[PDB]
């Protein structure tokens, strides 16, 4: 919903006016500070040149208050399924020895299991021993060797990214509208700065934050809701704990790439002459994802996901007190003369005064051409910016007042000529 709350004026020290082709244009190259509104309020910026009928609004719509989290350490994990292969060889046959299978290197591939080829997969090479004699398939009295080649592969068609948050950044999801009519949706948190087509914007004051996030780990799911775990971050993988096999990307887990980590001595083996049963006790994070699925009520806030951009946020029921810093890098602002004229009519007025909700004004714009209605009061403290087109449409914005008996006269102009207009309506006390 539209409605510029705070109203400021462009200073003459940062405004350069000129004339090109009988068109008075202005150039902004400075810094203008303004206080950010609450949920629904805005912070318009009107440009003034050498006359009074030339006005270019800079509407900045505020969606709502959000508390983004700063992601630090992160790792991918998921379920897997071991697939080991066995191949017993006789003693003194190729590489079948009693002293070689015991001290076998895990990062070395023997000539027995070298029949597949190149494969980037988290694989290992064990070395077990069996008995000899003709009772199990052997010719020499010395014990034989049982080479085991086990590789890990993903059994489930999905992965989860377990990460944490070091600080909760109060992100302000804004919606800056350019002078020509281009609408851009950006976001500002704590003291971050973004870049647009007219310069840059950042914050100035941020008095809102949630402490105590290092002892909480989050889990990202491919569009199936996030989760929260009540334990500190896991940096050392070990057995008997959630987080023993990690990696670095989703493709490294779904396709099982050798660029991940795993706990040593985790894959259990059952040597039975020539049999093999690769059974692992992998900790499945799906149970934790089910028992700790968002939303989860903690203390007095609400933790959920985020809209538009992928990320974790936090809902807060507090006040919104922040400022805005508008930077300008020699931006050209032109004005052709708006459009045609148009008639306006009052409808209704409801809402509140001296509160964050505001008062909703009802106006009926009736014109014949596509334009924008620019109204103003007497002392230059209120303005109405509503779109206009051919036909009779009902528009309105959010206004703020300090008196329940609003009796202020407005001066609306569709193309330069102003007309008197009086509004009225009672309000209720709210903060």
């Amino acid at each position: 919903d539209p409605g510029c709350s705070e109203l400021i004026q462009a200073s003459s020290r940062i405004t350069t006016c000129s004339t090109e082709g009988v068109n008075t244009k202005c150039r902004l190259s400075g810094t203008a500070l303004i206080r950010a509104g609450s949920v629904g309020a805005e912070a318009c910026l009107m440009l003034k040149g050498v006359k009074e009928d030339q006005t270019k609004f800079l509407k900045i719509k505020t969606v709502s208050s959000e508390l983004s989290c700063r992601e630090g350490q992160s790792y991918w994990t998921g379920s897997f399924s071991p697939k080991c292969l066995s191949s017993r060889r006789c003693h003194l046959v190729g590489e079948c020895h009693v002293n070689r299978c015991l001290s076998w290197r895990d990062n070395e591939t023997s000539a027995e299991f070298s029949f597949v080829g190149e494969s980037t997969t988290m694989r290992e090479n064990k070395c077990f021993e069996q008995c000899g004699g003709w009772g199990c398939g052997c010719f020499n009295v010395n014990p034989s060797c049982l080479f085991v080649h086990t590789y890990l592969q993903s059994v489930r068609k999905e992965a989860l990214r377990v990460f944490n948050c070091i600080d909760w950044v109060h992100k302000l999801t804004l919606e800056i509208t350019d002078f020509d009519g281009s609408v851009s949706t950006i976001d500002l948190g704590a003291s971050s700065s973004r870049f647009t087509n007219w310069g840059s914007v950042s914050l100035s004051l941020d008095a809102e934050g949630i402490s105590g996030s290092n002892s909480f780990s989050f889990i990202e799911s491919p569009g199936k809701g996030y989760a929260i775990v009540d334990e500190p971050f896991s940096e050392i993988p070990r057995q008997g704990f959630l987080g023993e096999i990690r990696c670095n990307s989703e493709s490294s887990v779904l396709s099982a790439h050798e660029s991940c980590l795993r706990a040593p001595n985790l894959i259990s083996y059952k040597p039975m002459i020539d049999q093999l049963e690769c059974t692992t006790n992998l900790i499945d994070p799906f149970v934790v994802f089910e028992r700790g699925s968002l939303p989860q009520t903690r203390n007095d806030k609400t933790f959920a996901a985020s809209k538009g951009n992928r990320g974790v946020q936090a809902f807060s029921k507090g006040s919104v007190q922040a400022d805005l810093t508008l930077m300008f890098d020699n931006f050209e602002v032109d004005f052709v003369g708006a459009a045609v004229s148009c008639d306006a009519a009052f409808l209704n007025l409801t809402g509140c005064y001296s509160c964050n909700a505001g008062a909703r004004v009802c106006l009926s714009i009736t014109s014949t051409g596509t334009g924008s209605l620019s109204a103003h009061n007497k002392d230059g403290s209120l303005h109405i910016v509503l779109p206009s087109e051919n036909g009779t449409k009902d528009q309105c914005q959010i206004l703020h007042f300090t008196v329940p008996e609003v009796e202020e006269e407005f001066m609306y102009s569709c193309d330069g000529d102003e007309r008197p207009l009086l509004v009225k309506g009672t309000l209720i006390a709210i903060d």
């Binding site: 292969l85 029949f115 010719f139 020539d274």
Partner: protein, 301 residues
Amino acid sequence: EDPHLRNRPGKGHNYIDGMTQEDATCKPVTYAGACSSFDVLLEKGKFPLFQSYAHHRTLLEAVHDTIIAKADPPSCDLQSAHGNPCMKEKLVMKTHCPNDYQSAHYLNNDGKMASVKCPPKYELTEDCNFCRQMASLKKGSYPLQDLFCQSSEDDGSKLKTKMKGVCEVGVQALKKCDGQLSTAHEVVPFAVFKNSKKVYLDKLDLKTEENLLPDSFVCFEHKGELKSFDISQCPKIGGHGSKKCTGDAAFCSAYECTAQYANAYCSHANGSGIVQIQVSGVWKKPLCVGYERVVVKRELS
């Protein structure tokens, strides 16, 4: 190549029907001769399974020894667009082979012997799937599969491919996948039985039984022609036998060594012996187990 591993028991024939222009050096297969149907099997870094198991038989050698039957047609005439049976069985396989080739044989779906044929003067591409026009060509048949053949009569016709979450792999048509499948080229071993189909196995367990069994050793006619010679006809310790035989410490530890009176030469090297494999949860004796790189279609979404 290694000339010591050129000994092939049995008849040792490696030639395809229809195109019998290469049989002067490959019928039989001896230590001499220049045939591309066998010299490529001894290359280092290409087919290590044949180097590890060199005392057994191959595909064509098993066909000429009444083990593996012939397909229909045995030689896929690659002179038209599709139509021939040797088409979809080759488009699904991904085997690397050099140029200057003509014929190539592999294992089909029914466990028989299927191959292709290129009439003069044509050759094959860089993969062997199609052909093209064009130094001198090799009249031999490049083996596309890396399997070993053995003499056995183990029953097993009601056993097919039973993998874990695989749509279509190789030439087998398992279950359909309505969602997005994971098309990738992987190496999955196979195993053929007696009058069965191509059975793929994900978790393979190789068994090597090398002991006092007659099929655990290898022997050939040699002084103190080159064909096969059975070991049960050798003499015993302190007794009398039909035909004498000599060897090393492994052969002399159980039998005797006559040297000048021996008409053959036995040895105990890595490449012979009764070999089993796991299938359907039990142990069975296969007939041709190898490694191939085909298109493995796994589930995803």
